[PDB]
Amino acid sequence: PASQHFLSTSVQGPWERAISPNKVPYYINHETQTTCWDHPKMTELYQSLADLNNVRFSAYRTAMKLRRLQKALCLDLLSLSAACDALDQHNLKQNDQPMDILQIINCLTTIYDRLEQEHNNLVNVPLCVDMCLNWLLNVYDTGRTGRIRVLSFKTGIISLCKAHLEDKYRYLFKQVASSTGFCDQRRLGLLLHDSIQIPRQLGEVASFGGSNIEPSVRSCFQFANNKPEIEAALFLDWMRLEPQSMVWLPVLHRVAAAET
């Protein structure tokens, strides 16, 4: 893998970055002679998230965890316009198609290079690429296949970027709606399924209705009076009620506004 040279500096000390057969990275600890699938800095972040386990309300606890992760990945510096610029340059338009590890890296590298030139040593590019990469594979490729759907990549980065909440909602709805702006139950399910993997990766899916989002699709279509398809305004109106499957997202925004 030609990208190995570039991302080998994301680790040091006793650690060494390596690659599996499906091009998925893994890390070697020489002092302790062990191996781990997660980047050492990501492990340290996941473990630190237990210091939030006594935060009382589920939506608020999960948002504070995702705020810390978002900042560790520098995704709070990424505007929706800049993300769309990178998605556009890498031709990621077919949302049902797979992206492999090198396409993930390439798109992340354009994103973090640009963030680095706008922010003063806030950004170490090889490090940021490799940690975001590890987050995305922990969320969407738990089978270690070396690929994720383009819809999935878009859902993770846009849910954690710095855009206004309604702009994220409009953008995600547009990724699953038809070319004329309509969504049926199947298409809404695609969006809610990718979204629910984010809290699921943190061990919190039980407070967001669980891993089957079919009850949440049915509830939105019931709210829409059982019509065969809905448009973005109706979706935005349902989201104002903060449905349980997605309530961690508006709460993440309240978290960031409150300062953290």
Side-chain angles (χ1 to χ4, degrees), residues 54-101:
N54 58 346
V55 166
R56 301 88 208 137
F57 294 111
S58 274
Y60 282 86
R61 177 180 54 264
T62 302
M64 283 180 207
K65 293 172 173 185
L66 288 171
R67 176 59 170 180
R68 182 156 342 144
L69 185 134
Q70 173 194 45
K71 299 206 333 254
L73 268 18
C74 288
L75 291 178
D76 62 317
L77 307 167
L78 180 69
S79 67
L80 172 53
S81 182
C84 291
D85 281 348
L87 299 168
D88 275 9
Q89 166 159 207
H90 281 87
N91 295 305
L92 300 164
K93 289 219 284 72
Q94 296 274 143
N95 292 329
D96 63 344
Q97 298 187 333
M99 298 184 60
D100 61 25
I101 286 174

Side-chain angles (χ1 to χ4, degrees), residues 158-178:
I158 300 306
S159 297
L160 292 195
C161 78
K162 68 169 178 160
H164 285 111
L165 183 76
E166 139 171 311
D167 285 345
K168 299 181 173 177
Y169 291 158
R170 281 185 184 285
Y171 177 89
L172 292 173
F173 180 88
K174 175 185 190 330
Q175 304 310 298
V176 293
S178 71

Side-chain angles (χ1 to χ4, degrees), residues 6-12 17 27 39-41 126-127 130-131:
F6 173 42
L7 297 183
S8 72
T9 60
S10 76
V11 107
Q12 71 223 127
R17 181 215 177 80
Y27 300 87
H39 185 294
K41 264 211 179 101
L127 186 59
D130 216 23
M131 295 188 334

